[PDB]
Design a protein around this ligand. Structure first.
Ligand SMILES: [Cl-]
Ligand SMILES: [Cl-]
Length: 162
């Protein structure tokens, strides 16, 4: 298992514009197009991202390319983030992937707001952090995915994904 297979399982793959769990226009492997309520606005963003007049549809290879860019950016954002870097650096490889998953889903700002959990993770207080992570909108809105990530932080294994 790895970061790519992990997020691919969590986000799925869709080749036509669609609305995510929050109702925002997305495409491919969880790639947010825009928060605007406008389909045209979404199609314009898509074409700009892909580099061609897509007509709201992309191929597999194009989804995957967006996906590569998104993982790379997420990792890079983490490393440039004063609040996240230290946590990231303190973690083992499996748990690092759990952190990337949260960032890919809610952005840097969003994750960086779980101050208390972040400190517990850094301290290697696994059980306590999983309990704190669970007290959140994130867990209440997407419980299945949140449980998989939380289990990953708790055990440091990919069991939840198998
Ligand atoms: Cl883009
Ligand atoms: Cl879910």
């Amino acid at each position: 298992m790895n970061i790519f297979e992990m997020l691919r399982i969590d986000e799925g793959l869709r080749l036509k514009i669609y609305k995510d769990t929050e109702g925002y226009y997305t495409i491919g492997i969880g790639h947010l197009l825009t928060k605007s309520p406008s389909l045209n606005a979404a199609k314009s963003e898509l074409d700009k991202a892909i580099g061609r007049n897509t007509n709201g549809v992309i191929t597999k290879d194009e989804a995957e390319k967006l996906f590569n860019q998104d993982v790379d950016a997420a990792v890079r954002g983490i490393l440039r983030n004063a609040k996240l870097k230290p946590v990231y650096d303190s973690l083992d490889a499996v748990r690092r992937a759990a952190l990337i998953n949260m960032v890919a889903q809610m952005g840097e700002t969003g994750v960086a707001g779980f101050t208390n959990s972040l400190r517990m993770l850094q301290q290697k207080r696994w059980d306590e952090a999983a309990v704190n992570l669970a007290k959140s909108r994130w867990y209440n809105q997407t419980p299945n995915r949140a449980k998989r990530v939380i289990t990953t932080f708790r055990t440091g294994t990919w069991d939840a994904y198998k």
